[PDB]
């Protein structure tokens, strides 16, 4: 991991199965409240409507260009991570000092790179697609939309994620064995010193 990211500490949010704008808004409010957040797996973020509807929405968005010089015009990113960063930017007051401080606390990433794969990632219940969208309703995928408008790196990240998942499975099995024998150690000590629990009327000044 590069030095500046070795220095990194914060919360890691699994962006998979999340509604894009609700995610963005939760992340934005928390960044303003001063949290550092890294929204990981931005290709697996969900958007609330049909694939074709969102494809046409992105088409009409990218229609907007500065006619005198486009290289100065609205930038329309092909990466899911960068699209998400722009939605979060829009939710933030990025044209102030505290607003740019929040936006620089934002730490969006694609796939799951290393400083964040070494960390416990969470999910926002509000903004979660399963917990929010009715099953009746349709939804799309940000990586699908981004490969539709370009973004040649979907499969490149799919392979890397498969590799990461194999390593994670190895570590998960080792962790299962270690938690087995850690319960073993706990019971071995439960023989020596019985665990005193909160549900006890014995804990008092005439006892103890």
């Amino acid at each position: 991991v590069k030095p500046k990211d070795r220095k990194w500490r914060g919360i890691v949010v699994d962006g998979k199965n999340h509604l894009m704008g609700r995610l963005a808004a939760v992340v934005a409010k928390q960044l303003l409240r001063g949290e550092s957040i890294c929204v990981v797996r931005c290709e697996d973020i969900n958007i609330s409507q049909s694939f074709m509807r969102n494809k046409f929405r992105l088409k009409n968005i990218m229609r907007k260009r500065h006619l005198t010089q486009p290289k100065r015009g609205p930038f329309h990113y092909r990466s899911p991570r960068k699209m998400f960063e722009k939605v979060v930017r829009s939710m933030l007051p990025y044209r102030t000092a505290h607003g740019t401080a929040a936006f620089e606390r934002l730490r969006v990433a694609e796939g799951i790179p290393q400083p964040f794969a070494k960390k416990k990632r969470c999910i926002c219940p509000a903004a979660h697609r399963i917990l929010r969208l009715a099953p009746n309703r349709k939804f799309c995928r940000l990586g699908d939309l981004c490969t539709d408008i370009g973004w040649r790196h979907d499969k490149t990240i799919k392979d890397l994620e498969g590799k990461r998942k194999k390593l994670a499975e190895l570590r998960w099995k080792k962790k299962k064995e270690l938690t087995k024998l850690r319960r073993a150690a706990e019971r071995l000590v439960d023989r020596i010193i019985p665990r005193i629990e909160y549900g006890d009327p014995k804990i008092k000044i005439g006892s103890l």
Partner: protein, 181 residues
């Protein structure tokens, strides 16, 4: 249901006895209104426009808020109403399973608002009645009129207080559990 924000009144009124009419007729309305102010309002809105007796020339003898006798047994209330639309008036018969008549009336009002964009002051309750389960003609009522209705809770979202609404929830949820936490 819970807190039908509606109180039932059985208002009784007449006109001030003039010397030509020393005993004017007496009318008794049944009004489902938020409070007694709105109740008496509706009573006089019917006194005028059905009897030419005006709030200023009339006289309320009783008001009598009515409380539900046994709110622990479910009844099937059929409400006959009429309401005004953008076009003219339409007659409606709807029915609701509820433990209280005021409950069924709040249910009717919110249902009419939902389905037809009707409003309280644009709905006028014609008679209400309680039906034996052999007299309910709607499907969404006849499906619960069985004795041992039974169903699971499948895509549940586990309502929880704001005190412990996890903003980040480092665990993995599951929409199909029993949902104690």
């Amino acid at each position: 249901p819970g807190f039908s924000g509606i109180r039932h009144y059985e208002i009784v009124g007449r006109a001030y006895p003039t010397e030509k009419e020393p005993s004017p007729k007496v009318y008794k309305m049944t009004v489902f209104a938020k409070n007694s102010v709105v109740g008496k309002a509706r009573f006089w809105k019917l006194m005028r426009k059905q009897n030419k007796v005006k709030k200023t020339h009339g006289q309320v003898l009783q008001i009598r808020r009515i409380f539900e006798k046994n709110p622990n047994t479910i009844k099937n209330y059929s409400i006959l109403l009429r309401y005004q639309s953008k076009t003219g008036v339409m007659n409606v018969s709807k029915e609701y399973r509820d433990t209280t008549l005021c409950g069924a009336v709040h249910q009717m009002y919110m249902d009419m608002a939902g389905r037809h964009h009707a409003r309280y002051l644009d709905i006028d309750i014609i008679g209400t009645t309680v039906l034996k389960p052999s007299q309910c003609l709607r499907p969404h009522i006849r499906q619960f009129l069985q004795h041992k209705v039974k169903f699971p809770l499948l895509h549940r979202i586990t309502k929880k207080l704001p005190q412990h609404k996890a903003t980040f929830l480092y665990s993995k949820p599951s929409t199909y559990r029993s949902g104690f936490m």
